[PDB]
Amino acid sequence: GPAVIECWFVEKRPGALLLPPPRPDLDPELYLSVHDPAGALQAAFRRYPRGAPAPHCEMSRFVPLPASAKWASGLTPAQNCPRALDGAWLMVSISSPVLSLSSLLRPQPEPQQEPVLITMATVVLTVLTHTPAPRVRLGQDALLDLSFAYMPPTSEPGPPPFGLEWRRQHLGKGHLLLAATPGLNGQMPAAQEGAVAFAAWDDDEPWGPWTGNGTFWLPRVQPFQEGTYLATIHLPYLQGQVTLELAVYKPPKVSLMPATLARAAPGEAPPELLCLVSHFYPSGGLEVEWELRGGPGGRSQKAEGQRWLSALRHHSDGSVSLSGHLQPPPVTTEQHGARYACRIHHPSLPASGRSAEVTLE
Amino acid sequence: SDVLELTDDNFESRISDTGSAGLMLVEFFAPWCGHAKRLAPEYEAAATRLKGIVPLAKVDCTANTNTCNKYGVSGYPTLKIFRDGEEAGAYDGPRTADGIVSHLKKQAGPASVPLRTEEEFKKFISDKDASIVGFFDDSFSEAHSEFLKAASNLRDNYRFAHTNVESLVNEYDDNGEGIILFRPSHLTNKFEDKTVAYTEQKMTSGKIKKFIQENIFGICPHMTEDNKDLIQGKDLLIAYYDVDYEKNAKGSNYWRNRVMMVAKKFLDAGHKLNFAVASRKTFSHELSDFGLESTAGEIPVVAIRTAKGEKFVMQEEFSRDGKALERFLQDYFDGNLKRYLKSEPIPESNDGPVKVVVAENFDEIVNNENKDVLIEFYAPWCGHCKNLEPKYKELGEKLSKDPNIVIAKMDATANDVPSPYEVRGFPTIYFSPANKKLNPKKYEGGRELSDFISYLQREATNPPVIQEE
Ligand SMILES: *[C@@H]1O[C@H](CO)[C@@H](O)[C@H](O)[C@H]1NC(C)=O
Numbered sequence: 001g002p003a004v005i006e007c008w009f010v011e012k013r014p015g016a017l018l019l020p021p022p023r024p025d026l027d028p029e030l031y032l033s034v035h036d037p038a039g040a041l042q043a044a045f046r047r048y049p050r051g052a053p054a055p056h057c058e059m060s061r062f063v064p065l066p067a068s069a070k071w072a073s074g075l076t077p078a079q080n081c082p083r084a085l086d087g088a089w090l091m092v093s094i095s096s097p098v099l100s101l102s103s104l105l106r107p108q109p110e111p112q113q114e115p116v117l118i119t120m121a122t123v124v125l126t127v128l129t130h131t132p133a134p135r136v137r138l139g140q141d142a143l144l145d146l147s148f149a150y151m152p153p154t155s156e157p158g159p160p161p162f163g164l165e166w167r168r169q170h171l172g173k174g175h176l177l178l179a180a181t182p183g184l185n186g187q188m189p190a191a192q193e194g195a196v197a198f199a200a201w202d203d204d205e206p207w208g209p210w211t212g213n214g215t216f217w218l219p220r221v222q223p224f225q226e227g228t229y230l231a232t233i234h235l236p237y238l239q240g241q242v243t244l245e246l247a248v249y250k251p252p253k254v255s256l257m258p259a260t261l262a263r264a265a266p267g268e269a270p271p272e273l274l275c276l277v278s279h280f281y282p283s284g285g286l287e288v289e290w291e292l293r294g295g296p297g298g299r300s301q302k303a304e305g306q307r308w309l310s311a312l313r314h315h316s317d318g319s320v321s322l323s324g325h326l327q328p329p330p331v332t333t334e335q336h337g338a339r340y341a342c343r344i345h346h347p348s349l350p351a352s353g354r355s356a357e358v359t360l361e
Numbered sequence: 362s363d364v365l366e367l368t369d370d371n372f373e374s375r376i377s378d379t380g381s382a383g384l385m386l387v388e389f390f391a392p393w394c395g396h397a398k399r400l401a402p403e404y405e406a407a408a409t410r411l412k413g414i415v416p417l418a419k420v421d422c423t424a425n426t427n428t429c430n431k432y433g434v435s436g437y438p439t440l441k442i443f444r445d446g447e448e449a450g451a452y453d454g455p456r457t458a459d460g461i462v463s464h465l466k467k468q469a470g471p472a473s474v475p476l477r478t479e480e481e482f483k484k485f486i487s488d489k490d491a492s493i494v495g496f497f498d499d500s501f502s503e504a505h506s507e508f509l510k511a512a513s514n515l516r517d518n519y520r521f522a523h524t525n526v527e528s529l530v531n532e533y534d535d536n537g538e539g540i541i542l543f544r545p546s547h548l549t550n551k552f553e554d555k556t557v558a559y560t561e562q563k564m565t566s567g568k569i570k571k572f573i574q575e576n577i578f579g580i581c582p583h584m585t586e587d588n589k590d591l592i593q594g595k596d597l598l599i600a601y602y603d604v605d606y607e608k609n610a611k612g613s614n615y616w617r618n619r620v621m622m623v624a625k626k627f628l629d630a631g632h633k634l635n636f637a638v639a640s641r642k643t644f645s646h647e648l649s650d651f652g653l654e655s656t657a658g659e660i661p662v663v664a665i666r667t668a669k670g671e672k673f674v675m676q677e678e679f680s681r682d683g684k685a686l687e688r689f690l691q692d693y694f695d696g697n698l699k700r701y702l703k704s705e706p707i708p709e710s711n712d713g714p715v716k717v718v719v720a721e722n723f724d725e726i727v728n729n730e731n732k733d734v735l736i737e738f739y740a741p742w743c744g745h746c747k748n749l750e751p752k753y754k755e756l757g758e759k760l761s762k763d764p765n766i767v768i769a770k771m772d773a774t775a776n777d778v779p780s781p782y783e784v785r786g787f788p789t790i791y792f793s794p795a796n797k798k799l800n801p802k803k804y805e806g807g808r809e810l811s812d813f814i815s816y817l818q819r820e821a822t823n824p825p826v827i828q829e830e
Contacts, residue, residue, distance in 0.1 A: 065395050080436030081394035086423050180742045182786055187649075188774060191742045198744040200786070217744050 001048030005094070007057035015059050017092065019045055020116040028111045030059070032090075032121040038149030038209035040126035041103050048098060055096035062091035062104055064237035071179055072163045074186040075236050084153035085237055090121065095243070100132035102240040125150050127233045127240030136221045138250035138281050138319055144216040146197075148233045148240065151209040159183070159201040159210040163234030166197065166216045168227055178216065181234075194219045223248050223281055223318030250319050251348045252280035256341075256356040263361035267330045275324035275342035275356060283312055287345040288324035293357060295338035303340060305329050335360050363408040365418040369425040377446040380415055382469040385443045386452060386461070388419040389429050394437040399456070406458035407465075415465045442468065455586065467520075472512035476524035485522050489606075490587075491577045492543040495523035496530045503564075504538045510566035511573070518591060519573060533558075540569065542576055545583075547606050550614075552621045553579050580628055581621045581636040583613075586643060595668045596634045598624075598690075600679075601641040601648065602661035613638075616661050616679075623683045623690060632694050634665070652703055664701075665693060672701040703777045714757030716769035720776040726769055727779075727793055733766045733822045734793040735804070735813070738773035743787040749808050756813045763826040765795070766817065795822040 005017040007030075015030030016023065019042055023031050036042045048055075064085045066076045092103040107121035126149045136142040144166075152160070161183035167174045177192045180199050201212045214233060218225060229244040257274040264270060277286060290303040303326060310323035324342050341357035367375055367387065379385050388404060390397040408417040422429035422437070432441060432448060440452035442465075454460045473495065476482045486492040493512075497505040505523065512521040524530065533541050540559035549555045557576045561568045583604060584592045600620045604613050617638045624636045641648070641662070645655045651664035651674045663675035663686060675689040692698045704720030711717045718726050718736060727734050737753060739746035757768035773784045781801055782791055790804035802820075806812045817825050 063393055078436065080396055080438065081391065083391075083422065083429075083435050083437070086391055086393075178742055180740075185774070185784065188740075188742065196742055196744040196747045199742075200745075215744075217747070 001045040001050070002054070005045070005057050006054060007059045007092070009059040011061065017057065018118065020113070020118050022116050023118070027119075028117050029107070029119055031111075031118045032105065032107060033113075033118045034105070034121060034123060036123040036126070037151040038123065038126060038211060040128055040147065040149035040211060041101070041123050044099055044101055044126075044128055052098055053096065055094050055098070058093040060091050060093075062089040064089065066237060067163060067234050067239060069165075069179075071187065071189055072165075072181065072234050074181055074184045075161060075163055075234055082153075082237065084155050089124075091240075095132065097133055099128060099130050100242045100244065101126065101128040102242050103127075104238055104240060123151065125233070125235060125238050125240050127231070127242050129231065129242045129244055131244065132242075133245045133247070135247045135249055136218075138222065138248050138279075139220055139317060142216075142218040142221045142225075142246065144218070144229060144231070144244050144246070146214040146216065146231050146233075146242070147211065148214060149209060149211045150235055152207075158204040158206065159208065159212070160235070162201075162212070163232075164197060164199040164214045165232045165234070166195070167230050168225065169230055170227055174230070177218075193225065221246075221248055248281060248318075249348045250279060250281040252286070252344060252346060252354065253278045254342065254344050254354045254356045256358050258358065261358050261360055264331050266333050269330045270328045270340070270360065273326045273328065273340055273342075273358065275326070275344070276321070277324065277344055278321045279315065279317075279319040280321070280346060280348065281319040282347075283320040285345075285347045286322060289343040289345070289353075290324070290326045291341050291343055292335070293339045293341055296332075296334045303328065331360055362405050363412050363417070364405060365416060367418045367420045367425075367428070369427040372420065372425075372428045373446075375418075376443055379443075379445070380413060380469075382415065383445040384415045384449075384465065384469055386415060386417045386465060387441050387443060388417070389422055389432065389434040389439040389441070390419060390437040391423050392421065393423075396456070397438045400438055403456060403458045403461065407461035410458065410462050411465060415469050417461075467516065472516040473509055473521035473523050476522050476526060476529070478526065479528055482522075482524060482526065482529055485520075486543040487546065488520060489545050489547070490520055491545060493519050493521050493540065493573060493577075494533075494543065495521070495540050496525075496533045496538065497523060498525055498527075498530045498537040500525070502538055507564050507566045508540065508569060511569040514566060515570060515573065519577070538564070540564070540572070542573065544577070544579055547610065548579070548583060548617075550618065550621065552618075552625050578635075578637075580624055581617060581638060583617070584637040584639040584644075589639075589644075592635070592637050593666070596665070598634055598636045598663060598665045600636075600638045600661045600663050600686075601644065601653070601655075602638070603642075603659050604638050604640045612659070619679075619681065619683045620661070620663075620686065623686045626687070627690050627694065632690075634690075634693075651701055663689060673698045674701045703775075705772065705775050714761050714768065715754055716757075716767050718769045718771035718776075720771075720779070723771070723776075723779055726767065728798045729767075730798060731765075731795060733795050733817075733820075735766070735768050735817070736791050736793065737770040738778060738782070738784045738787070738789045738791070739770060740774045740787040741772060745808075746788045749788060752808070752810045753813075755810055759810075759814065759828045760817070760825070762828055765823045766821060766825060792816075792820060794820075 003019060007015045007017055009015045009030050013030055014026060016026055018033050020033060087106055090105045090107055092105060094101045103123055104125040105121045105123055107119050111117055111119045128147050129145055131145040134142060134144060161181055163181045166178040167176045176189050178195045178197055179189045182199050196217045197214055199214045201210050226246055226248045229246055230241055232239055232241045255276050258271060261270055290307055292301050292303045293299050295301055306327040308325050313321040328340060339357040339359045341355050343353045343355050345353045376385060420428055422434055442449045442452055454464045476485060495508040530537060533539055542557045544555050559572050602616055603609055606613050620638060641655050648655050651672055653662045661679045665673040673693055677685045679685055702720045707719060707721050708717050716726055727736055760766050760768050778784050791801045792804050793801035806816050814827055
């Protein structure tokens with residue numbers, strides 16, 4: 001994967017993360033040589049798809065501070081700031097269609113270096129997700145992947161208690177769906193919509209660093225659960241946040257009525273054909289095409305006759321249905337054996353669409 | 362401002378030039394610390410309001426690693442008091458201007474404040490806290506000396522004063538040497554005297570200390586953040602409500618008088634128990650240990666915490682009659698009350714395949730001496746628990762025919778987990794043998810249906826009957 005990552009520092013200033021090539025174009029208090037003890041940040045970009053676009057990166061000044069929510073207060077019992085967190089911090093936000101990551105770095109006081117002018121920085125906490133734009137089938141369970149890694153102050157038991165929070169946000173209005181602080185028995189907010197999470201440290205080795213899981217499990221997703229999901233990992237005074245964009249979808253089932261046609265004499269018109277486009281989502285982008293296959297004009301010609309569309313039918317699960325209708329013209333003898341079909345197109349379907357046909361006699 | 366800024370450079374030097382008492386308060390901090398930023402205003406106020414008395418300094422640890430390392434600062438803010446240049450203990454007080462100024466003023470000695478005029482006297486015992494006043498007309502008295510020993514030993518918890526003023530000494534003693542304890546006048550009440558006289562024949566520091574401890578509070582003191590550590594610990598009944606003697610003195614007395622009204626009866630009758638009233642707000646964080654709702658209702662809520670740790674909560678509402686409180690006390694002393702436990706309601710129907718355990722029926726189910734009980738402690742949010750749910754339900758069904766084994770589960774976040782057991786993470790599974798109810802074994806095995814069957818066959822008390830298909 002990428003060796004360096006162009007980044008923007010905000011409060012823009014150009015910066016870069018080096019996962020040493022000189023860079024007179026950068027600060028270099030904004031040119032970071034990344035030491036990642038826990039390894040999550042480096043492992044994420046080692047897997048990065050080759051030739052994949054450069055990921056978006058934002059850098060900013062971070063100030064350790066107790067979590068604001070009261071449920072997380074348990075992580076910070078003592079009423080005083082740890083000295084081990086003295087020194088400046090930078091929060092790194094990386095997003096792409098491949099992943100969405102957040103990191104807390106501790107850069108050295110001064111840039112200087114014998115080989116090249118660059119600032120040494122150490123990765124303390126990494127929060128990552130490999131499903132930044134999940135697409136779950138309506139009625140199915142959604143598993144929003146989440147992993148993290150923490151490197152404790154080597155200035156001084158097993159991995160410490162931590163906090164995990166998942167919420168769905170919309171227009172500054174956020175709804176907490178799940179919260180936990182594994183390793184610290186406390187009063188947690190009620191889990192919503194049947195959600196649960198695999199929140200835990202991957203192992204309990206003596207000194208660390210450590211990696212952990214926090215993937216969210218949302219049962220039988222419906223269209224109203226569609227949207228922006230924020231996941232936050234908490235450590236005393238430290239927090240990392242990632243954004244996921246959940247899309248719900250359901251391809252339509254296509255069928256015709258009558259399912260089969262009886263024999264008919266020339267100049268006679270077949271019965272109105274009904275193309276049922278059932279239980280699909282989103283409602284938009286549904287297109288209906290009527291064709292006459294295997295006829296006196298190639299095995300694909302646009303059908304003739306009157307055609308129309310039903311209004312949308314709305315189901316409780318949020319999916320929708322609709323009907324296409326076609327009144328074919330009087331049948332010719334040179335149409336015998338040909339089939340009338342409806343070609344359905346919808347973003348949740350292949351390029352060729354989905355069809356249903358009936359044979360003429 | 363009036364806050365001296367010390368550094369690795371001038372600390373050792375500037376830390377000695379102290380005011381009169383050789384005392385200096387030092388704040389070790391970092392400007393990025395939230396708590397430090399919050400204290401800043403207060404500390405500036407304290408400094409100026411103590412000018413001349415006791416100097417206040419602050420050391421920026423980010424810029425002075427050597428002095429912070431020397432005094433072992435590991436968190437901000439860290440307030441230390443220095444005497445004549447050496448560490449003299451941390452400042453154990455609220456991080457407010459009032460808290461700081463008052464503590465240091467007392468700290469800036471004397472252990473016992475000398476009263477030279479009735480004016481000074483009246484003003485000393487007009488404090489919100491009690492007053493321990495010694496009356497001595499002889500400058501070389503051994504009693505006056507023993508009193509000063511007490512003052513020094515206890516100056517940390519009580520207010521001491523003494524006087525030789527003719528008037529005062531006469532009015533409060535006959536023999537020219539006595540000690541009067543004055544309870545805060547705003548708590549004066551028709552149920553006990555506002556002052557208590559020392560009556561021991563001899564006057565020794567030890568006897569004085571015991572005399573103080575035994576009488577300063579009366580039958581029902583007002584527990585505040587300042588004196589809680591002196592009131593809690595023993596069998597204690599606390600009535601919580603809108604206790605505030607500044608803006609709600611009437612309401613405060615109204616309820617406190619009804620509490621003391623009942624207390625006195627049981628107390629005079631010989632029963633043993635301490636009483637106290639406290640602000641539902643100042644101690645709102647304690648209300649949850651008794652499962653009490655802090656509604657702005659104003660009506661008081663009562664709860665007892667034995668010295669052991671037992672918790673008893675009055676269920677009946679507080680009657681302005683006192684009869685309700687009298688009932689609760691009767692039961693308490695008669696052993697009729699059930700201790701308090703956080704617990705979900707006992708389910709209406711709890712008929713397998715997995716027994717549902719809550720704190721109220723825990724003993725009945727898990728501790729039925731005649732059974733082997735495998736209990737799973739889970740959490741609503743835990744994913745691994747959700748995956749085990751079905752597999753665990755099957756285990757229950759397969760053991761349905763066995764009359765010795767019970768398969769149960771309890772939501773450990775919505776129910777107090779009884780002493781023997783310790784819930785580390787989720788899920789925590791325990792196995793409680795039929796005759797080792799005090800020694801349940803923590804299940805460390807796998808969480809597959811086969812692992813549970815295997816475990817039970819290998820640990821059951823009596824050979825297990827596992828339905829098999
Ligand atoms: C997170 O936990 C789930 C369930 O145990 C597992 O399937 C998934 O692979 C884990 N992912 C990580 C980050 O290891």
